[PDB]
Amino acid sequence: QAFRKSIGIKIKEETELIEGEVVEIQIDRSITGGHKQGKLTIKTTDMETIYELGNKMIDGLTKEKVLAGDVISIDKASGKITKLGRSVQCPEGELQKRKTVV
Protein backbone atom coordinates (compact mmCIF):
# COMPACT_ATOMS: atom_id res chain seq x y z
CA GLN A 1 0.00 0.00 0.00
CA ALA A 2 2.91 2.37 0.66
CA PHE A 3 4.55 1.30 -2.62
CA ARG A 4 1.29 2.18 -4.39
CA LYS A 5 1.01 5.43 -2.41
CA SER A 6 4.40 6.70 -3.58
CA ILE A 7 3.62 7.10 -7.31
CA GLY A 8 1.01 9.48 -8.71
CA ILE A 9 -0.82 10.09 -12.00
CA LYS A 10 -1.57 13.43 -13.68
CA ILE A 11 -4.74 13.54 -15.80
CA LYS A 12 -5.90 16.76 -17.49
CA GLU A 13 -9.06 17.83 -19.31
CA GLU A 14 -10.72 21.01 -20.59
CA THR A 15 -13.96 22.60 -19.36
CA GLU A 16 -15.96 25.70 -20.34
CA LEU A 17 -16.83 28.57 -18.00
CA ILE A 18 -19.22 31.51 -18.40
CA GLU A 19 -18.56 34.35 -15.95
CA GLY A 20 -20.46 37.62 -16.09
CA GLU A 21 -22.59 40.06 -14.14
CA VAL A 22 -26.31 39.38 -13.71
CA VAL A 23 -28.72 42.15 -14.70
CA GLU A 24 -32.09 40.66 -13.70
CA ILE A 25 -33.65 37.23 -13.14
CA GLN A 26 -37.08 36.27 -14.53
CA ILE A 27 -38.12 32.66 -13.85
CA ASP A 28 -41.52 31.24 -14.84
CA ARG A 29 -43.35 28.36 -13.14
CA SER A 30 -46.96 27.33 -12.44
CA ILE A 31 -48.98 27.27 -9.21
CA THR A 32 -50.26 23.75 -9.84
CA GLY A 33 -48.35 22.11 -12.68
CA GLY A 34 -44.65 22.82 -12.28
CA HIS A 35 -42.10 22.77 -15.12
CA LYS A 36 -40.08 25.91 -14.32
CA GLN A 37 -38.86 28.16 -17.16
CA GLY A 38 -35.98 30.42 -16.21
CA LYS A 39 -34.60 33.50 -17.93
CA LEU A 40 -31.82 35.81 -16.76
CA THR A 41 -29.40 38.29 -18.30
CA ILE A 42 -25.61 37.90 -18.13
CA LYS A 43 -23.45 40.99 -18.70
CA THR A 44 -19.74 41.80 -18.93
CA THR A 45 -17.60 44.65 -20.25
CA ASP A 46 -18.08 43.74 -23.92
CA MET A 47 -21.06 41.32 -23.88
CA GLU A 48 -24.60 41.53 -22.50
CA THR A 49 -27.04 38.73 -23.38
CA ILE A 50 -30.11 36.98 -21.94
CA TYR A 51 -29.74 33.28 -21.08
CA GLU A 52 -32.77 31.00 -20.88
CA LEU A 53 -32.45 28.30 -18.23
CA GLY A 54 -33.45 24.66 -17.94
CA ASN A 55 -34.88 22.63 -15.09
CA LYS A 56 -31.57 21.87 -13.37
CA MET A 57 -30.45 25.49 -13.71
CA ILE A 58 -33.47 26.54 -11.64
CA ASP A 59 -32.85 23.58 -9.33
CA GLY A 60 -29.35 24.87 -8.60
CA LEU A 61 -30.61 28.45 -8.85
CA THR A 62 -33.24 27.94 -6.13
CA LYS A 63 -31.30 25.53 -3.90
CA GLU A 64 -28.61 28.24 -3.77
CA LYS A 65 -29.83 31.77 -3.11
CA VAL A 66 -28.84 34.36 -5.71
CA LEU A 67 -29.87 37.92 -6.62
CA ALA A 68 -29.72 40.28 -9.58
CA GLY A 69 -26.82 42.06 -7.90
CA ASP A 70 -25.14 38.70 -7.23
CA VAL A 71 -22.83 37.45 -9.98
CA ILE A 72 -22.51 33.80 -11.06
CA SER A 73 -19.95 31.72 -12.94
CA ILE A 74 -21.44 28.61 -14.54
CA ASP A 75 -19.67 25.48 -15.75
CA LYS A 76 -21.55 23.64 -18.48
CA ALA A 77 -20.17 20.14 -17.88
CA SER A 78 -20.35 20.20 -14.07
CA GLY A 79 -23.75 21.90 -13.88
CA LYS A 80 -23.04 23.55 -10.53
CA ILE A 81 -23.11 27.31 -10.01
CA THR A 82 -20.36 29.46 -8.49
CA LYS A 83 -21.98 32.50 -6.86
CA LEU A 84 -18.73 34.42 -6.56
CA GLY A 85 -19.49 38.10 -5.98
CA ARG A 86 -22.20 40.72 -5.73
CA SER A 87 -22.71 44.21 -7.13
CA VAL A 88 -16.45 41.16 -4.38
CA GLN A 89 -17.19 41.14 -8.04
CA CYS A 90 -15.45 43.38 -10.53
CA PRO A 91 -14.99 41.26 -13.67
CA GLU A 92 -13.09 41.61 -16.93
CA GLY A 93 -12.43 39.47 -20.00
CA GLU A 94 -14.69 37.55 -22.35
CA LEU A 95 -17.94 35.93 -21.24
CA GLN A 96 -17.42 32.26 -22.16
CA LYS A 97 -13.87 30.97 -21.69
CA ARG A 98 -12.39 27.46 -21.79
CA LYS A 99 -9.60 26.53 -19.37
CA THR A 100 -7.83 23.26 -18.58
CA VAL A 101 -8.00 21.52 -15.19
CA VAL A 102 -5.37 19.02 -14.00
Partner 1 sequence: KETKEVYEGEVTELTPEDKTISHVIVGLKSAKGTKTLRLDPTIYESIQREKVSIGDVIYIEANTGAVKRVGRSDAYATEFDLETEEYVPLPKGEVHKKKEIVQDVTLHDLDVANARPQGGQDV
Partner 2 sequence: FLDSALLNLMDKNVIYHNVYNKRYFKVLPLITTCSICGGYDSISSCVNCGNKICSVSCFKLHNETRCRNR
Partner 3 sequence: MKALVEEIDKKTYNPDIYFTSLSRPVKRINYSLADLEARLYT
User: Which parts of this chain interact with partner 1 (CB under 8 A)?
Assistant: 31-32, 34, 50-54, 56-57, 76, 79
49 scored as a contact of partner 2 (CB under 8 A): yes
Of 6-14, 38-46, 65-73, 83-91, the segment contacting partner 2 by CB under 8 A is 38-46
- Measured from the CB atom, the residue of 29 and 97 that comes closer to partner 3 is 29
Q: Which amino acid is at 38?
A: G
Burial class (CB in 10 A: 0-12, 13-18, 19+), 72: buried
77 scored as a contact of partner 2 (CB under 8 A): no
Among the listed residues 38, 44, 27, 28, the one whose alpha carbon sits nearest the alpha carbon of residue 85? 44
